[PDB]
Structure formats: structure tokens, C-alpha cells
Symmetry: C2
Subunit: 147 residues, 2 copies
């Protein structure tokens, strides 16, 4: 239950999460109060999960990023790992995945040596083997698609 | 230079990309005016690259997501795969990578059938083999970390 109007709103807020109510309204052809309340409704279903600035991770010191695939050293408990890694700040994304491994993490760090340290912390905190794939270059990312 | 006032700014805008030129200035102890200038220089210097609402993908009927690892078929052609795929719009992200594959894509799609399809189109449009990994669940995603 997402009408043409909501489609326009998220498509605009995807492209520009600081879009203003007045700007959105003159694009959907609605009043700024219609818009404000369509946006709150989108936000409280979980259609729009929050707004974030797209910060360039090299500018701030994360010069190495990596996908690390992780798999249980002992498969037996239900799977703690996303909970237990939630508090390592250098882990930015955690997905469970089909195939031989269980999760994939995107991870970002200052250097090669900071990467060895982090692999250790992950090995130990989630009791998990790791397979690492260094990212050499991001060509574009998060480009969200509303169809 | 990232004057650790600029540091408090990006932490603030990453967790909340709508936080307003004022509300910021409070928790950052500055004039609404100087807060406005930095932000303008921060986007100029490519430290903030943009603002995005973060849209839940199922909510828009992207029920299957996948990492897709690609490697070009003919090492003698110019290797321009990121550019040949850039027009296909359900590729959300494309990285080059030191692994077993040349690049990794994050891709979103309606269903398993739609993916098979996408992949046919990926193979033929860049000239690549595909190896893909299906995401069952996203535990968290873009948690941007600032040192
Ligand atoms: N790797 C498993 C799926 C799985 C995902 C997460 C887990 O914690 C465990 C298993 C498979 O392909 O069947």
C-alpha cells in the first residue's frame, strides 16, 4: 500500500534527504501539511528508516574497507553474532547470506595493521572464522532505486 | 585538516541528516552562521557527498537482494565494467576488490526470477561471468563510524 504520491516523495528524499516540505509539496502537487503528514506516515511504517548524510570515509580516516565473510567456529547455539558485533564500531553492515558462510560484514579501518587487529577482535568476539576481501575502490554506492 | 569541530558535525549529520542548521549549533556551541559555512565547505571539500533518506527495500518490493561477484571474460578488452553497468539501475553499488573476482555488486530485485534475468543482462552488457550470493536478512546497514 504505497500510492503514486508516496513513490514521488521517497524517490525525492532518496535523492535528497534534506528536500524541504515546501519543495516536496510543490513537486507532488500537495500542501505542505499534506506532505508533512504523508512523510510521517512513511516514517512510522518503516518505509523511511532515517536520514543520514553521506560521508566520504577516506576524508575521515577510513583508508581501508573490506568485506569480511564469517562463519561459526561451532555452529551449535542460535546465532549470536550480529548481536555480539553490534558494538564494534568499525563494522558498518552485517548481513546473513546463503551458501557456505553465514554473515558478510562491511568493515572500515585506518590501515592494514588496523585491519589485522580488527579481524582478531571479530574472531574473538563472535567466535567465528573469517574470509576477508579488501575493497580497492568504490565506483558508486547506495544508489537507491524506487521502481 | 578536519578540525574536530567539523568532526562533531559529521557525527551529528550521519546519525541525522535532517538535524537543522540551528539544533546542530546548540550541541556544537556555534552561531547558526558559522555552522552554515563549514557545512558549505564540508560539501565543497568532498567530505559530505550528499543527503539521503534511507528507504527500506522490501517496502518498495525489492524482496531479494544479492552480492554479485563479477569477473570479465576477456582480459584483452579494456576493462570498463563499472561504467558499462552504471546505467542498470538495480545495481546499487559496485566495488573492485582483491579476491577471487574482479568486482562485487550489491543488487536488488523483485524476486529470484527477476535476478536470473538481471544476471543475463549483466553478463551480456559487461562481458562478465557472475557468481552470486543471496542476502537472507540485513541486520544493520550504513552505521557510519567517525573516529
Ligand atoms: N549459510 C546458510 C544460511 C545461514 C545463514 C545464517 C546463519 O546464521 C546460518 C545459516 C545456508 O546457505 O543455508
Amino acid at each position: 500500500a504505497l500510492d503514486d504520491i508516496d513513490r514521488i516523495l521517497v524517490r525525492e528524499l532518496a535523492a535528497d534527504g534534506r528536500a524541504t516540505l515546501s519543495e516536496l509539496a510543490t513537486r507532488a502537487g500537495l500542501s505542505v501539511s499534506a506532505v508533512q503528514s504523508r512523510v510521517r506516515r512513511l516514517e512510522s511504517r518503516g518505509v523511511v528508516q532515517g536520514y543520514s548524510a553521506r560521508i566520504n570515509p577516506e576524508a575521515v580516516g577510513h583508508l581501508l574497507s573490506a568485506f569480511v565473510a564469517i562463519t561459526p567456529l561451532d555452529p551449535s547455539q542460535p546465532d549470536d553474532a550480529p548481536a555480539r558485533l553490534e558494538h564494534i564500531e568499525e563494522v558498518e553492515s552485517c548481513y546473513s547470506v546463503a551458501g557456505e558462510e553465514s554473515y558478510v560484514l562491511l568493515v572500515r579501518v585506518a590501515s592494514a595493521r588496523a585491519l589485522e587487529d580488527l579481524l582478531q577482535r571479530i574472531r574473538t568476539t563472535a567466535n567465528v572464522r573469517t574470509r576477508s576481501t579488501i575493497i580497492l575502490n568504490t565506483f558508486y554506492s547506495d544508489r537507491q532505486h524506487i521502481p
